[PDB]
Symmetry: D2
């Protein structure tokens, strides 16, 4: 996370850390608990190539990475079949846990938005994770969960910005309709925030608008953060995850 602050312990009870087997169980991406048995993440965290499920675990909400790990094994990785790269789109995946988790006020699911919600500019939205605090700058120990409030911008505005300082023709769409844009040169997600949630408070409910997907660096001029637009993939999610 670029800008923002350490999250209060009572905020973001759906935040998860994805861990890869190595010298230790290392954080490589975020996710969100959308069901006691299901984690929502980015496809680019777990694909497009098929990996050994034994090499993956999930960690539920931790204030500080690694200090109190209780790792959960995964039974299934489901990756959107249209996914190949984040810039092409369909950057969305599901992890099925081997067992349902016990939910509480400290650890519980995020609400998915209804199909009609567009998340226009001036919506209050937050992105959370344990990623880099700037381009090529690691989150230092003790690895506190960060949050930052990011301004939403309309896709067409964001598309026009991505074309400034580029050879790409103005008519060749960069920011696609299954994507959502937020952030500026002080407030963004960064490497290690991938797969984590962008959440907006709508009529007193926290809704997941986005999955951290991609950008040209982090907090760079005319290069806002890009997110998988959750409303676009509700029917695909609801094929796997009970309502």
């Amino acid at each position: 996370i670029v800008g923002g602050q350490e999250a209060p312990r009572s905020k973001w009870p759906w935040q998860v850390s994805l861990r890869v087997h190595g010298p230790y169980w290392m954080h490589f991406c975020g996710g969100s608990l959308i069901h006691p048995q299901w984690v929502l993440t980015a496809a680019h965290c777990v694909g497009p190539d098929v990996k050994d499920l034994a090499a993956l675990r999930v960690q539920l909400r931790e204030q500080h990475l690694y200090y109190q790990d209780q790792l959960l094994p995964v039974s299934r990785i489901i990756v959107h079949p249209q996914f190949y790269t984040a810039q092409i789109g369909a950057d969305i995946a599901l992890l099925e846990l081997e067992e349902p988790v016990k939910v509480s006020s400290h650890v519980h699911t995020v609400t998915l938005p209804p199909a009609s919600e567009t998340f226009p500019p001036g919506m209050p939205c937050w992105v959370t994770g344990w990623g880099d605090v700037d381009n090529d700058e690691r989150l230092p120990p003790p690895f506190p969960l960060k949050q930052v409030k990011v301004p939403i911008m309309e896709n067409h505005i964001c598309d026009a910005k991505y074309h400034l300082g580029a050879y790409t023709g103005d008519d060749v769409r960069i920011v696609r309709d299954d994507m959502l844009c937020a952030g500026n040169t002080r407030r963004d997600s960064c490497q290690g925030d991938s797969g984590g949630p962008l959440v907006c408070k709508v009529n007193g409910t926290w809704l997941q608008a986005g999955v951290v997907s991609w950008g040209e660096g982090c907090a760079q001029p005319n290069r806002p953060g890009i997110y998988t637009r959750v409303t676009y993939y509700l029917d695909w999610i609801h094929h796997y995850v009970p309502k």
Copy 2:
């Protein structure tokens, strides 16, 4: 180049090295001389973001990088306007030299194929360059120009291979119609060969079939090298380069 050998001095008179300003004029990509004043390369070498022409030079055929440099300034970079990433496609660009080169038997142009030419599967073609000799393995000093014979593979077969061990749906195209495929787990192009030529000898003439574009690593199982299909972009090339 993976699984290659050092090129004879008399072969590949069209090979060029692209150089970026730093502590020295470092090789970052290949190219081909298609006209005395024009170099053909990959868009991803020089875009999609706009670069300073002052930081770029061209070096014509060298047996060993850096030994006998005579660096040429570039007057214009023309990146295909449909280019954003190599996986989306249109991975092709033109460098206009500030002066035409005086051609010789040692340094001269490659022939572009006719629009009709379909380089059939199995045909023996060659790819050349000063790139890595394996995944994350640098070409050692003294940096000899390398060559490897790579068989052409039909797009449908190559697309099918990229789907093996992948979550991507079989009906979702990975290798697109403006791309061409060559190589196996012993013979491939690699990082630093980007923008360089894939050449095939047809009716006793060397024709440039491909521009080194992308792949999943180098010489990996079921991940052949992907190239920009030159026949696809002949009308765009001929818009700038005299016939």
Copy 3:
């Protein structure tokens, strides 16, 4: 620590972590609390070149580095004036804290040996710290304090081992009389344990025999860990530290 285990919370109440100012207060060396206002460490941690006291802090015993830091400022660095390199010797230094520590069962001082004490070969001693777990292998998060039992070895035997597979003449001393030797190819101290204590239980009391100094890598054949011999420098320590 090589071949160790995580320390019980009740053990090694004198262990300290030395911290340098940067993007965070990073652990670079160990130390021991020998008096409420004094830390014993290696000269090579803090010399021979003069450093800014503002850039140094001390952290008293913590089970996991960085998690619950309470960083203590240092009023003075005293590096033995005969120190230039660890292999020459006098690898010993004192940090004077700005305030005396309030001692407890969890955090308190280690006992210095009497001048006469000869820690005989084969005696069970312990070395502790947050250093590497093998050659160029970092302690993973969450950075637990580690411990390993290492047998004391006679200087003459240790000197003889350093000469095996070396050009150095057998009559040319490598392990000097102000040094002490411990460890084998399964059990050693390593990079980041420097300045930490080697403690031995004598007549029911923990005595500090050694300060982690140097070696040829960690746990290498015929290259035991070398330590500053504390008994050798008692008169220098007691010049500054009340008895």
Copy 4:
């Protein structure tokens, strides 16, 4: 080499490159040809631990590293038996080639100084090699042999400078009597120049005064370059090398 310039082809016919077996025969130290069968270098380049001779070769003078290699195998490595570290001293070694080389005006031996020559300040002296051009700054391709004129300073002056900004007591000698000091903040040897020659022209003959040994970084304030003093080790050299 810090400061100075590329050496003319006609200068330093005694300069040698030491090569270690890896992905390529990589330069790690310099040397000097003192006899058709013998190379003079630093002990720290080849010791104190015994290595496999098959992993070492010698390259005689080349203007550009790697471009025209004709590598020579070594029959013997002879390291001063008093050597353990450069700062302790006796930083001197001999390589015996398997065959005598053919000498010419382009490749020939350097003259050793007579026992009485002290090399006082104001002597014109040069140091040569393919080492770093500044602290952690590699010689760029094409790796030209560099030279720099370095001012000699008296041992006592150099010893006093090494004490400025240090804890080491003023009467604890750092610069030892078997060592020689040259350089300033514009002109020095650096990492990769180790084992190479410091040569001074005395009564129209080039004499090797020094072997590149050590320093605190390169061209740093109050830290001139330190060399093994060749006159100190003449009797040891003459045990092995014919006059």
